[PDB]
Design a protein around this ligand. Sequence first.
Ligand SMILES: Nc1ncnc2c1ncn2[C@@H]1O[C@H](COP(=O)(O)OP(=O)(O)OP(=O)(O)O)[C@@H](O)[C@H]1O
Ligand SMILES: [Mg+2]
Length: 274
Amino acid sequence: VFHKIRNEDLIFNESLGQGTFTKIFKGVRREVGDYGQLHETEVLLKVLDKAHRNYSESFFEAASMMSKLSHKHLVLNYGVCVCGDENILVQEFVKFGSLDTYLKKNKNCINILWKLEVAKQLAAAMHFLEENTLIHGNVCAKNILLIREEDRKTGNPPFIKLSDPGISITVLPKDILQERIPWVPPECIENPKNLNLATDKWSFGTTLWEICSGGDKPLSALDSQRKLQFYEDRHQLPAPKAAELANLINNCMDYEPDHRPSFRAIIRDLNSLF
Ligand SMILES: Nc1ncnc2c1ncn2[C@@H]1O[C@H](COP(=O)(O)OP(=O)(O)OP(=O)(O)O)[C@@H](O)[C@H]1O
Ligand SMILES: [Mg+2]
């Protein structure tokens, strides 16, 4: 179970926007750390909407199972604050924020080598999850957080972490799921209980498309009815103009879940490039 954090030890500062039934804030946590030393630590506070408190079990279940695993490319959760009427996840604050935002802001400056490094790191994280038979269920560029920027001067690559899953697609309303096409795979639109390890291979493909597409969101021009028909017609996403990962994207986004490559195979493919 999660460490319980007192509301009195948390200060809410600026809003970072809204997620799926959540409000996100930057905050400060006062804590006693190692050696009895007092700290004030920057934290990310995820607040489940009061109106959607029926989703709290899924909201926290997500975080919990993954926080039972420690991995360098997985975001650290510090604990929960369940004081009063609020349900709050207290998470590590990742300095450079979401990859999708970063891709759009720095697109002129991002090259294939940076992209490959980030893809490899994401694949490493997903391989670890696969090995542990843990389904993430919401792999996407917004849910990849940049801990550190590339520094050519020192040969340091960028470094990312994958955030928590959030409320499971197995409990979310149909209209939200449809809006999340083409991250949610076709079999999960058919039946959200089809959530499986193969789910994350599909979403990984979509995420690679994002990584190659400068922060663009695939199929954003299609309304929900048209996104449904896209899957009914068995279309694939267009190749990004920077096409180096296009074959890998299509191999991951295979309409037959059984044919989607293992993360081991994905990593081998990535290692074979530039
Ligand atoms: N750990 C973090 N550190 C720094 N910024 C973060 C962190 N997590 C989220 N953010 C910022 O908060 C914004 C909202 O995040 P996001 O949309 O993932 O919310 P969510 O509650 O996780 O919803 P979903 O389940 O849809 O992902 C993001 O764009 C991101 O920049
Ligand atoms: Mg998120």
